[PDB]
Amino acid sequence: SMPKDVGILALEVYFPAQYVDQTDLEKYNNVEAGKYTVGLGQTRMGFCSVQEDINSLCLTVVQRLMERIQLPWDSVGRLEVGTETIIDKSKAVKTVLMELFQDSGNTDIEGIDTTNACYGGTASLFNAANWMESSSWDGRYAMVVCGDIAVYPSGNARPTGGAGAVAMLIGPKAPLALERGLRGTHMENVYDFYKPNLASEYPIVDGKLSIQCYLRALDRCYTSYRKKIQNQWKQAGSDRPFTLDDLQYMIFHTPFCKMVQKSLARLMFNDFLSASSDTQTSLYKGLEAFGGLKLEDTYTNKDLDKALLKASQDMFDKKTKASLYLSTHNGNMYTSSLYGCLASLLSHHSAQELAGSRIGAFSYGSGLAASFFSFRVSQDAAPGSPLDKLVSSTSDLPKRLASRKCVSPEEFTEIMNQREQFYHKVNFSPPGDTNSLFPGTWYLERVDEQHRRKYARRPV
């Protein structure tokens, strides 16, 4: 008897207590007004000083989740971290997270860390569902943790960084149930974005190539997903094709907001090119002029790009725009970006609005690994229902974002420079007033002579 409706029961997001404003950053970088706020679609970018690291981000979000829902230590049977922020080549963040469990005597917890660029959180989610449905499940919850500190050198990528983490409690009878058998996955060997300079926080990135690879992976994953759901539909006696009309919401890994608007447009072009001649003429009149073009052309053909943005605007506004709130206010937090979009979706809509819907999700990691998958939302939206509890837990997201402190581009730059200076340092205590951290935040208190990191927690 495989457990039913395996999925997300609870979700917690963490982001740092300061950001740099994109309009300010434009002026600081001497670029044209609107290049970041309109061109990239970004409003504010969160960032961390050396006082926070991947361990402290994950400790913070996990302990906050457990405290909020009063989760017993003995109730977690799997705990796994997805990240691409590596501060130790052998020792997993999972082992550090055991600080939260081991003293209580609960150390029989499967899972370690798993990495490929921005895809590791999804890998951990899939692993958790796989475990829970297997002969190895022991009735306990799984906890999926992901997070990252996304930083670039001064230059055109710097405004697309960010930072944060997400923890998700996975269990049976979940209000956001993973739709079984529907993982459209695509992996291939590319060099769009990678981190081969082991002593640098910075990736090597080919911006244009990374955008092309994200979109090609989207094409492939969407095709795989459609094939799989159509096969299920056929078995159930329906020959209809899957299109964006079959998704009520659609969320994406979000390196910047404009990327996602273009990505929803790319999905519509896929629907169009896959549609019958009749359907094309009936539903896609504005796209008929482009019936002979290729998916890849949405990136090079300006008339096509514009037509697609126009044609998909309503769907974007209805299915995707709300999910971008955290991203536009915090930036790209890599593995947890997609899950921050899920949080934003939950924060915007009522349980009654979400009830019974399908949420499509696209996860990408450069290099590359990608999956398109979906959740089915419970029909039960009554007060006190699992769905109501989940939705309610996210409602204060905009207030939380608003409580952060704006930092000048000058000071932000100094803090980034400090990250470079301290990257490899030992025997030191990270500078910074702990009063500038949110209550309950774990932080790096000291790196000792032997490069061992010690953490402390701001009360509350």
Added chain:
Amino acid sequence: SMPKDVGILALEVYFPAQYVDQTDLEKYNNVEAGKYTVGLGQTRMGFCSVQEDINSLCLTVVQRLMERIQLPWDSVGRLEVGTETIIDKSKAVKTVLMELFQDSGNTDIEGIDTTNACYGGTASLFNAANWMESSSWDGRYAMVVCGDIAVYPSGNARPTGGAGAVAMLIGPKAPLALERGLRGTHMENVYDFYKPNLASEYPIVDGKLSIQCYLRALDRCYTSYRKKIQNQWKQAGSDRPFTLDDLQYMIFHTPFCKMVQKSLARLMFNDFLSASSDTQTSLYKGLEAFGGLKLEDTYTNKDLDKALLKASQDMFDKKTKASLYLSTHNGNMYTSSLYGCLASLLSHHSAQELAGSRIGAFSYGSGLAASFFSFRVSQDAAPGSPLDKLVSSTSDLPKRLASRKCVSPEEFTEIMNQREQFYHKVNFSPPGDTNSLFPGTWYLERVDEQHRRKYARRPV
């Protein structure tokens, strides 16, 4: 309908074509004769020049496996790498392995990389079984890959390095079936061995602490495993305790061979301390003098250590010794060490001898993460059976090891120094005669100006 007897169908091992002799290394290091060959129990240590890296090791073992069993590209639905040899902080070895699959059009392959010290291979194995038993299984095989290049600076740890990789094909109806529900797992936050110097290949290691942590994890995992199997036995109407008598073979992560002899002894001490007063007097006469001591004392008490080695000698010879052949001749290859012991076990015994048996397995990774689990071997040992095929595939292991070239400690040291020199280099082709590689070996042909690695393959 969950698939039956999920487990290992095929196993491939790769190790480099040269080793340094431990007796020679003793003389080179000016250490007492026998310190390495007797003290550590090591005979020869495999090593790689800069011409081989974690990607090339994994490409080699995967392609060799697929060619030997003529595995169709479309037959693999999950592929995941466990390793602690990190040469890119974002881009997974899995993505590079897609070079073997993507041109054939099979890119819908779940899995990425997973890391914690020497435990990642096991994590990948568990993830593969979990996937295969879940709603996400699509009928295809999983492939578990692990490998590592284990190197230390000049000093007392250097003789306990090694290198290699293993690929395992996982599927239903396997001749080595994972015993369901029997994973005794223990994770906790320690600093016994870790790699915080991102630009160095070398770990920070506290040797004594690492030995203590391995043994403590062994205690915890064995206790967890015993509890779980005893619970299954109780449900089946049996109250008897599990002991080493219930294992026909017992294989371990092997940092060096002496460690493993002491580990089997530690398990016997656990049986003894857990046994009834009556059982103690009947079966453990030589241990009664120590009935008041603690598990941890096997490391500090010489009388106890000696008594345990003597008392467990017969069990060691029968259950564990044969499994150490590859380890004594190749060294510690980290994540794939345990699985090399499995290969050694298969190479030594006939299918008829193994048929129907239980193989216990202990996997450890510093930091730490550990699991004690087991396999049930098929009863079918007829010629051409899955078990016969698996066993036969390993029979030439000693011949393969014997075909390697012995390199002087002087030249070995130069090659290690060269690894340090070239670690971060770009825009170069690794020196070394490709004729010194085994046929069919992938190797690093060039690292370009953008730190992109290009691989080539020695024919056959």
